[PDB]
Nucleic acid binder design. Sequence first.
RNA 1: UGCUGACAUGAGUAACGAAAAAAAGGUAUAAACCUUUUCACCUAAAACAUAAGGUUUAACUAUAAAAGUACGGCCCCUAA
RNA 2: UAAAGGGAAGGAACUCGGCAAAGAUAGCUCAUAAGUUAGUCAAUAAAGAGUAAUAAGAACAAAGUUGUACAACUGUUUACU
RNA 3: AUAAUUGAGGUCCCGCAUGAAUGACGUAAUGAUACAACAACUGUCUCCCCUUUAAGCUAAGUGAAAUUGAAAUCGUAGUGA
RNA 4: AGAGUAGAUAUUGUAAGCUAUGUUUGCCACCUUCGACUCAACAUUUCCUCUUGGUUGUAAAAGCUAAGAAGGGUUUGACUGUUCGUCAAUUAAAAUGUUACGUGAGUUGGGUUAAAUACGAUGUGAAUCAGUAUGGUUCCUAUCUGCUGAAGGAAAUAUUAUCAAAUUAAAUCUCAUUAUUAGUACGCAAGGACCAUAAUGAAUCAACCCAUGGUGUAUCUAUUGAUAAUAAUAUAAUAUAUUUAAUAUAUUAUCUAUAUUAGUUUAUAUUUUAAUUAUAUAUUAUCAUAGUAGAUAAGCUAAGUUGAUAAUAAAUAAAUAUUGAAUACAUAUUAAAUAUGAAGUUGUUUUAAUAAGAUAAUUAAUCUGAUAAUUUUAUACUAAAAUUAAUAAUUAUAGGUUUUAUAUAUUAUUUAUAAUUAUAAU
Lengths: 112, 229, 125, 109
Amino acid sequence: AVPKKKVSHQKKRQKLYGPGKKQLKMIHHLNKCPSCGHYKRANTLCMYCVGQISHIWKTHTAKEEIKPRQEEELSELDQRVLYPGRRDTKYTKDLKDKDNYLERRVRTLKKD
Amino acid sequence: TVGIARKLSRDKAHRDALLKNLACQLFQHESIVSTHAKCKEASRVAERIITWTKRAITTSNSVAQAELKSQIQSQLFLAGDNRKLMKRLFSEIAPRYLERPGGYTRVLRLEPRANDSAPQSVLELVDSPVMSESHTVNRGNLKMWLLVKSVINDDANQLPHNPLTLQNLHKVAKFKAEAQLHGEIMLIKQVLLKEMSLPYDEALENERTQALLKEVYSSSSSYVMVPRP
Amino acid sequence: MIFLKSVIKVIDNSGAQLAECIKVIRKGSPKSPAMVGDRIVCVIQKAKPVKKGDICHAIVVRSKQRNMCRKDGSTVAFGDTACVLINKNTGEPLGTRIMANDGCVDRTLKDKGYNKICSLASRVI
Amino acid sequence: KRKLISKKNKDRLKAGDVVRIVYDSSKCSYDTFVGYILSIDRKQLVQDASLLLRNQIAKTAVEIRVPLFSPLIERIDLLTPHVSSRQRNKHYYIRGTRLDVGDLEAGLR
RNA sequence: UGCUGACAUGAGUAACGAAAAAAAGGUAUAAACCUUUUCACCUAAAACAUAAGGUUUAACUAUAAAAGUACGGCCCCUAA
RNA sequence: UAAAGGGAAGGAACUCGGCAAAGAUAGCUCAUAAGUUAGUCAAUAAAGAGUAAUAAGAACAAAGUUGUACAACUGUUUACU
RNA sequence: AUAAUUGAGGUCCCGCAUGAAUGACGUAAUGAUACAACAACUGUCUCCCCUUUAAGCUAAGUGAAAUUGAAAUCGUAGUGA
RNA sequence: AGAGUAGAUAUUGUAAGCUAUGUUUGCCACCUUCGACUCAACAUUUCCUCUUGGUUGUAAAAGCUAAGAAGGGUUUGACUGUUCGUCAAUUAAAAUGUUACGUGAGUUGGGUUAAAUACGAUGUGAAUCAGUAUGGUUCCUAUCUGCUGAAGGAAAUAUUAUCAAAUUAAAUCUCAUUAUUAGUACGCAAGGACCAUAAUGAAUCAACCCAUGGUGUAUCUAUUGAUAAUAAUAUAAUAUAUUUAAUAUAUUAUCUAUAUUAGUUUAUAUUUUAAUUAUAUAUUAUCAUAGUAGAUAAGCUAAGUUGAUAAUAAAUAAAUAUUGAAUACAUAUUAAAUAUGAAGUUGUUUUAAUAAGAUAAUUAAUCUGAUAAUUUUAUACUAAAAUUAAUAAUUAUAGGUUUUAUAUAUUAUUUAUAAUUAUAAU
Ligand SMILES: [Mg+2]
Ligand SMILES: [Mg+2]
Ligand SMILES: [Mg+2]
Ligand SMILES: [Mg+2]
Ligand SMILES: [Mg+2]
Ligand SMILES: [Mg+2]
Ligand SMILES: [Mg+2]
Ligand SMILES: [Mg+2]
Ligand SMILES: [Mg+2]
Ligand SMILES: [Mg+2]
Ligand SMILES: [Mg+2]
Ligand SMILES: [Mg+2]
Ligand SMILES: [Mg+2]
Ligand SMILES: [Mg+2]
Ligand SMILES: [Mg+2]
Ligand SMILES: [Mg+2]
Ligand SMILES: [Mg+2]
Ligand SMILES: [Mg+2]
Ligand SMILES: [Mg+2]
Ligand SMILES: [Mg+2]
Ligand SMILES: [Mg+2]
Ligand SMILES: [Mg+2]
Ligand SMILES: [Mg+2]
Ligand SMILES: [Mg+2]
Ligand SMILES: [Zn+2]
C-alpha cells in the first residue's frame, strides 16, 4: 500500500523521463497549407483558412438583429428617464472582461 | 451490440437521440463542427437517411415508398426548426444526390480543441449549393471554398497548381455541370477577394477560371516487369 | 445431462416411478454429467405399491438436452430425461418391458450396444 | 430440396406445416419421422440449413432437427399445410401450451 | 513517535462527489458564460408559495414600498 | 470491480446456514379447516372459484406450509459493531 | 426422519450440577428472535457464459493521502539477537 | 523369547538394545488462530500405475512381504465450525507429509479470547468458569523484491528486408474398461492367467465457432398505459402573386385547433353557450428495468466440434544371466571380457525466447524504417498486421453505395408489364 522509503532523486527521474512512452515526441507530421503557405498539421484542414471561411459565412448568413420598433425613435432624455444604467456586481464585471479569461486562436508560422 | 457502431460513452437511447439530433442539425445547416467520433457516426446515419429518401423518390412500389417515408420519419426529430425538414429532404436535399452512389457526407479533420484536447472535425453535405438568391452566398461546402482559396493563392504566387488540388477539383466536378461549376467558382472568388486584401479584375478572373476548368475537364521506376524465363 | 440429485423418469415396469441420480459410473470426476447411454446409480424416490429408498443402477435412455450431436449432423431432444433400471453385475434390464405408453429412446443406445433395451422400446428415434 | 425453403418460392415450407421425413434405406436403416415444423433454420451458406420439428408420442414429446441437405434424407413430404391462425416465423412458443401439436400419427389414422 | 518553519517522497498517481446531451449565434475568443432551437431529467418535485437559518448570496448602490380587511410582527392577554 | 438483464441440461449437489438471487395465475367479489383464551384470533388462512385471459405479454400492492426452544402480546434498548 | 444425520422431533431417567413468583408446567395468538423439516423457485452450485451501464485504460485540465535513517533494494545454501 | 497344522527368521517379533526424524504430547524461555474457499509448489518413509526378489504360508486368480521407481494420477455426498471421525456411493488409488501445522495487503469468519443477555455450577457479594447457549467491528489506491504479460533504448564478431539451426527456458509424459490370445496355461472342482494387441472411453491440455445450445441496449414484430409530433383533409387569420368588379373566386406560403360564461364556497371534469378553434384520419417519436413478451445477424462462448496423452532410439535402477580367475571348488565382475532389464533417465514431440548461418540490397526520380491518415486479422497504452490506387498499367482500408444472402412477419385474395382480361413472376 505504502512506500517503504523516500524515493531517491535518481530513481524518480529515471521512472519519469527514462522511457520513450513518457517523453513528448516531436510533431514531424506537419506541412504547408495550400491556401496560404503556413504550417498546418498533416491530414488536417488549416485552422486559419477554415476560420476565415466560417467568418465570411456568418457575415453573409447573419440573422437580422431584431431591434424593437419603439426604441428606435425613443427620445434620448426619455430613454434616460426610462432605463437608467445601474452599477454591475463584481461577478458581472469579471464576466464582462472576457479578454482576461478567454483565449483567441494563435496563428502559425510561415512554412518554407 | 459489441462492435457494430461506436458507443460514445452514452447509453442506447441517449446515443440514438444524439445521433438523430446531429443528423437533423447537419440537414439544417449543411456543415457543422463537432468531435471526430460523433461526426463519424452522424455521417453514417445521415447517409442512410439520404439513401432512404432517394429510394422513396425513385421506387414505383407504393408499399416500399410508404415504408421508406416511415423510416425517414422515425430517423428524425421534426419539431422546432426541423418541422419542415421532411419536406426539405425530399424537395431540396435528396435530388442533389440522385446520380451519386453513396458518399453524401464529408468529414474533415480539424485541430484538436485547446481546452479538452478532443479531436475535432467538420461534417458536411457534399454538393451543397453555394449561392442562394436574395442572400449572396450560402452557408455551404467548406471544401470547395478551401479549394478556391488555394487556387487564388497559387494565382497570386504565379505558381503551378498542385496535383492534389487538381485531383480535388476533378472530384468536385465529376457530379457537376461545367458551366454551373464555373459560375460557383466565380461567385466564391469575388467574395474571397473581398475578404482578403487582393484586388479583383473580372474578365481576367473569368479567363483564369475557364483555363482551370479546361485542364480539369478534358483528361490527358527501378523495377521492370518481365515474364518468367 | 444428469448430475447429482437430478430426478428422472423410470420408463420401466420394475415399479420404480421416479429416481434420483446419486452417481455416474464410468466417468472419473463426480462433477461430470451422465448422458444418454451412460450408466448411473440412483435412489428410487417414488414407486408403485423394488421399493422407495432402494439404491439401484440405471441407464439413461433419453434426455431433454438439445445440443447432443449425432454423427449424421442431426440432434434429437425429448420432453423428459428417462432411464431404465438394470442389474448390478448382469447389466441387463431389471424390468421385463419398457412402458409402451412412454417408451421412446435415442438410437444412440443401439450404437452403444444396449440391444436388449432398444428392442424393448416402443420406438427408437 | 432447395426449392422448398426458397424465400422466393411461394409454396415453400413454413412453421406450422406438418411433414414426413423419409430417409434413404440404402444409406441408413432409420425409420421415417413425422413432425410439425416449429422452425426452418436458414444460414449464411445454403447446404447447412435445417428444420426443427416436433411430435408428441403417447404422452411424451420429441423434437428433431434435421439437416435438410443430408444425403441420408431422400425427400420430405408435406402432409398438412399450416393454418393462417398461428402467426410468427418460429413457433417455439407452442410447446407446452394449448397450441401444442398432439399426436400427428394419430391424426393421420 | 521533540517543538516551529520551509521543502521533499508517494506523484503528476488516486480522485474531481448520485447525471443526458447536441447544434447555431454571441465571439476566424468558449466542452464549462449567455441566447435560440432540438433532446432529456424532476414533476403530492429538482415546481410555486413560505417558516428558521446565514459571509447580501438577489434580477444590486438609481436596491428589497403597507392605516387594515384569506398581512405578520409591537400592542393587549396570558401558558410552560 | 460495482450496479443491472438474460441464460441449455440439471434444481441446494453451494454454504456454518437456501446467505444472496429466484419464485406472485386479481389488487374487486365470493369461498376459506384444524386448533382456540370464542376474537373471521388463526385470516390477507392455505388450497379453490367468479369476471379477464389462450401465448404474447406496463409499473406499483401482494411471496409459502409445518415442528421445536425462548418470550404472552403492540412496545423499548447498547446515537456509531 | 436421510442413499448415508455429532443437526431436528419423539420418548427413556445414575438430574456430573432440575423444580414451583431468581416462579413450575402444557396451549391460542403474536416475533425481521433462534434451531429444524417439506413444498415451490432459482447462477447458490455442477460451471460458467454472454450483454449493458459507471469505473479501470489513453489524451487534456486540476491535483491528494498514509509512508519515508540513507540506498547503486536479485536467487539459493550457510551464518547470525 | 514366542506364534505360524511341523519349523525362530513365508508372514509374524513381548520385555530389554542401538539409532533416525523434529509430522504428536511435552520441557526450555533466545524471541511478543482452527476450519472452509482459491491457487498450489516441494518431498518420498509409494496408495494406485511400470520393473523386479521371497512366498511347506508362489497350482492359477486374488494376496501377503521386500527392492527399484516421484513420470502421470490420487473423490463426490449425509452428519458436525470442525482438520479429524462415523456412514453412503464410487474409484486403478481414494498415500504420508513439508511449505509461518503453505496461502486472511488473495476470499470467507462457521469455531475461537471483548462489550448485551440467559442457564448450570462456584462465591456472602461485585463477579467468576479447561462450562453451555443467541447476538455481535478493523482497513489499505502497491514504493522496492518477486512473479504474469507488453513496450522503448541498446553494442550488431557491427547495416537493412526476410528465412532462420544448435542451445536455453518451460509444457507434455497418462489411466481404466471391454474384446481378442482363451474358457487356452494352471487346477479334483470352483475358479481362471502372464506375455501381447486392438477398440471404447477417463481425466488433462490445446485449438475452433461449419453446425448445436446461450447471449445478442440494432432486430423486426406484438402489445398496456400517458404524452408529444409530421403529413393529409375541413375550418380561420395573415402575407404574397393571379383572376374579378379595394371586393369576391382560386393558387402558393406561414401561423392557428385556442379562449370567455353558466350551472349556489374552492378545484377539476362534464354538457350547454361563445369561437375558425377539428378527425374511432396515415405515419412517427419519447417514457415506463431495453416498459413488457416472441423470435433474432455478426461476435463472443460451452452444454458443442476437432485434435493431442511424443513414437523409434541410446545408456541404465532394482533385478536376471554367460564365461571366468584371484582362492585346484565356487563366484553374473566390490577382477579382465560378454549379455538381458522400468510409466524412471537421456532423448523425441510441443510453445516462448535468443539469433549462429543463409538469401538479397547498397547513398537512394518509388533504399530501409519512423512520424501522419483509414483500419482489424491485433489491441489497456503500445506493439503486430492490412491499406494510403487515382497513371501507361495493376492493389478496396474503413464508411457509404450496390449484391445476393440472413434476420423479422405479413404476403398468390399478391406484385410487375399491356388492355374485370393476357403474360412474367412473390
Ligand atoms: Mg530532533
Ligand atoms: Mg502508483
Ligand atoms: Mg493507475
Ligand atoms: Mg482516474
Ligand atoms: Mg459532479
Ligand atoms: Mg461557440
Ligand atoms: Mg397528479
Ligand atoms: Mg422558491
Ligand atoms: Mg460441501
Ligand atoms: Mg449440503
Ligand atoms: Mg412487495
Ligand atoms: Mg417479545
Ligand atoms: Mg419466567
Ligand atoms: Mg415487536
Ligand atoms: Mg491526466
Ligand atoms: Mg523408495
Ligand atoms: Mg498474506
Ligand atoms: Mg503480508
Ligand atoms: Mg440478527
Ligand atoms: Mg457457434
Ligand atoms: Mg449466435
Ligand atoms: Mg420521466
Ligand atoms: Mg474429445
Ligand atoms: Mg478495382
Ligand atoms: Zn492556411
